[PDB]
RNA sequence: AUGUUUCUUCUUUUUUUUUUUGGUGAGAGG
RNA sequence: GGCCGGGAACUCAAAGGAGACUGCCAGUGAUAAACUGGAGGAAGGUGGGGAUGACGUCAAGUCAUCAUGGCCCUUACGACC
RNA sequence: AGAACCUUACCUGGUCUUGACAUCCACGGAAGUUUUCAGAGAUGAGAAUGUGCCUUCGGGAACCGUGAGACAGGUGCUGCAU
């Protein structure tokens, strides 16, 4: 159903004058594996209850991508603050990799043919913010079908 | 209505009636509302501008009466009108009556 | 009076024990010698009880009759699996989730039609 | 130096003391040598029997003992000889015959003690103790008792250095002395260590 | 105005009950 | 000599409770909160006092109340006068 | 919450080393009881005599000795091992 998969965790603090409380933030992502994509920003003060608490917001952030042939549509720029990660177009490649913590991201998702690289400082925060966001104003054909032209098979040859 | 004083004090039981009345005008007639509505009227985005946020995050289509000060960021039915008027709001909620007379049959 | 306080249940799934087994009913016990009745009709069709089994099931109707049982409970009929989805699903007891409809051949096959007012959840 | 025991300022006045019996200053001391080290013997036999209070009540010239666990059948054992076994061996101790109450109690975990040792009986062999509170903690909690802080101590986890931590759920009152929770402890002594426990469980009210 | 040196950690797996109104004496029927 | 009768008024003796809450009055103050005067009362603003020591700091002390992992003595560091 | 012996764990000297105390193994002594002593006391050197109940009555629990012991004993250390 929701296709759980669970990757982070590191210690926060806060230090107050008792000392300081190691806080865990805990990231992970949902989706169904052919379309619907949508992660939950998730923090405790210990590590179960943090991957439970960041289930209730990745079920109401999954966005659709419209998933052509359980792959991309074209190469789309995932630059966001922190990581400036291209998503390269490969056409039935029949290769799984993308980014470390990145590509447990993209196993929910469903794909099997696609390159990545992630430009810049090697965080894993900014990765699951943008490879929902490169994944977000990339669109299939029909729909830049839809709105330039205005001739829908022209484009389509 | 029937007890609610020979159980404990009558002192305390005005702290009760404060915080029954005070969470009765605050929560209404709406105790008996289904939770999560379909829809949620609003008249002025200025200060009630966290149910606009709050209401677009669900997928619920909600309204807005608009005046010169208030943006449309967020909102879904952008409806001009002076949110500054006794009789002419309820000429707006005169109006809706019509459609909710509708809205029952 | 202890019916009266137990309007849920005069209309909620009733758990009972059953006393006795008849060709045409079964007699269950409630407690506090309340007795409730399943008719033929109520029961689902490849179900055999024993005497000492524990059964739930809908009460649809109290009767004030001056003989006979006064209690009528249901696993037939659709109220029950309209029932037994309310206690399965907290969204639907609730009121998050609505069921408006629910058609039911019993022991067999049933169809219910669910609805929500929020967009955030999928009813199904 | 902290924790008093809710306890013992709240015997009597809403729950009953754990021996209730006269003496004089001069028959003090004999009545109390026989609690002791008998309740030492019934520890050591009926610590697998579940119990959870041990009142201790001799009048003048008599002695009885109310055992409260939950599973008497093997303090009974088979056919109440074992309850005699209890008998023979405290009538030649004390000199006056001590007869025993086994009264128990429908519920076993809703009680201070057997939480108690639910964890030292299974301390042993290494347990995430966490879940292994968590499961008792969470049973009690929504078996009715509507408040608890459950505690355990020693070196946790194979450590060394100091570690204690609390898992509150419900009502805890210490400022309360009207409300109604326990609290009782044992130790759990190995090739490691001493690992030991306690527990505030709350029941209610007036 | 002054206040060494080398030393402190971190969270997701363990848990069966339950208890083995008799005698004696007389008469009579077959 | 309350010592000897008598008495159930009364001090004392000891129990289950009645008794206090800003309840009431007025000024002021945002119809609120609220301070404090007026009243009676045994007591007027948590009536005087005690008990209860939150999360936690000193990784504060104790192995000499007791428990207890290693360590060593175990013809001694153990035991007796 | 009270340092003449004690308490006392420190010191001098004189002492037993399976031992002040515990359970068990073989066998003996029954157990008990007053008193004369080398001696600072310890400990050790002795003399008179006694013997309740169960008796599966080829002897056993309550008490000590001598011998092997497993252990027993630890106010000896580590409070930053709990």
């Not at chain 1, 430009?119 to 966001?133: E, F, K, L, Q, W």
């Not at chain 4, 968590?134 to 946790?156: C, D, F, P, T």
Request: cysteine-free; aromatic content about 4%; proline content about 4%.
């Amino acid at each position: 159903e929701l296709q759980e998969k669970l990757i982070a965790v590191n210690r926060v603090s806060k230090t107050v004058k008792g000392g300081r409380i190691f806080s865990f933030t805990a990231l992970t992502v949902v989706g169904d594996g052919n379309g619907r994509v949508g992660f939950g920003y998730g923090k405790a003060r210990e590590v179960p209850a943090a991957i439970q608490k960041a289930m209730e917001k990745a079920r109401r952030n999954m966005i659709n991508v419209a998933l052509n042939n359980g792959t991309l549509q074209h190469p789309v720029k995932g630059v966001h603050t922190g990581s400036r990660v291209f998503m390269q177009p490969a056409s039935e490649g029949t290769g799984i990799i993308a980014g470390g913590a990145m590509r447990a991201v993209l196993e929910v998702a469903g794909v099997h043919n696609v390159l990545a690289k992630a430009y810049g400082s090697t965080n894993p925060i900014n990765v699951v913010r943008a490879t929902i966001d490169g994944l977000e104003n990339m669109n299939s054909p029909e729909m830049v079908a839809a709105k330039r032209g205005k001739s829908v098979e022209e484009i389509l040859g | 209505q029937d007890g609610t004083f020979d159980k404990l004090t009558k002192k305390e039981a005005l702290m009760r009636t404060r915080e029954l009345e005070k969470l009765e005008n605050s929560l209404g007639g709406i105790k008996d509302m289904g939770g999560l509505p379909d829809a949620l009227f609003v008249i002025d985005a200025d200060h009630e501008h966290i149910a606009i946020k709050e209401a677009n995050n669900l997928g619920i289509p909600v309204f807005a009466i608009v005046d010169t000060n208030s943006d449309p960021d967020g909102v879904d039915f952008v409806i001009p009108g002076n949110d500054d008027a006794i009789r002419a709001v309820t000429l707006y909620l005169g109006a809706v009556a019509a459609t909710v007379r509708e809205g029952r049959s | 009076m202890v019916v009266d306080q137990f309007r849920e249940h005069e209309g909620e799934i009733i758990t009972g024990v059953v006393k006795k087994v008849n060709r045409d009913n079964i007699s269950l016990d409630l407690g506090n010698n309340a007795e409730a009745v399943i008719l033929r009709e109520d029961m689902l069709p490849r179900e055999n009880f024993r005497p000492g089994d524990r059964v739930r099931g809908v009460l649809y109707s109290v009767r004030p009759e001056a003989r006979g049982a006064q209690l009528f409970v249901t696993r037939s009929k659709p109220e029950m699996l309209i029932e037994l989805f309310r206690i399965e699903v907290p969204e639907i007891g609730e009121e998050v989730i609505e069921i408006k409809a629910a058609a039911r051949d019993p022991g067999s096959r049933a169809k219910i039609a669910v609805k929500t007012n929020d967009k955030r959840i999928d009813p199904v | 130096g902290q924790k008093v025991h809710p306890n013992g300022i709240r015997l009597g006045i809403v729950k009953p003391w754990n021996s209730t019996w006269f003496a004089n200053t001069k028959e003090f001391a004999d009545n109390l040598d026989s609690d002791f080290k008998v309740r030492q013997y019934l520890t050591k036999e009926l610590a697998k029997a579940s119990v959870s209070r041990i009142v201790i009540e001799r009048p003048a010239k008599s002695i009885r003992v109310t055992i409260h666990t939950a599973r008497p059948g093997i303090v009974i054992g088979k056919k109440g000889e074992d309850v005699e076994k209890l008998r023979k061996v405290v009538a030649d101790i004390a000199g006056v015959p001590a007869q025993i109450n086994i009264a128990e109690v429908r519920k076993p975990e809703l009680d201070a003690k057997l939480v108690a040792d639910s964890i030292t009986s299974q301390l042993e062999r290494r347990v995430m103790f966490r879940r292994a509170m968590k499961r008792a903690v969470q049973n009690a909690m929504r078996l009715g008792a509507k408040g608890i802080k459950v505690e355990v101590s020693g070196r946790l986890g194979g450590a060394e250095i100091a570690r204690t931590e609390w898992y509150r759920e419900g009502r805890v009152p210490l400022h309360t002395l009207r409300a109604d929770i326990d609290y009782n402890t044992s130790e759990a002594h190995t090739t490691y260590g001493v690992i030991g426990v306690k527990v505030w469980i709350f029941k209610g009210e007036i």
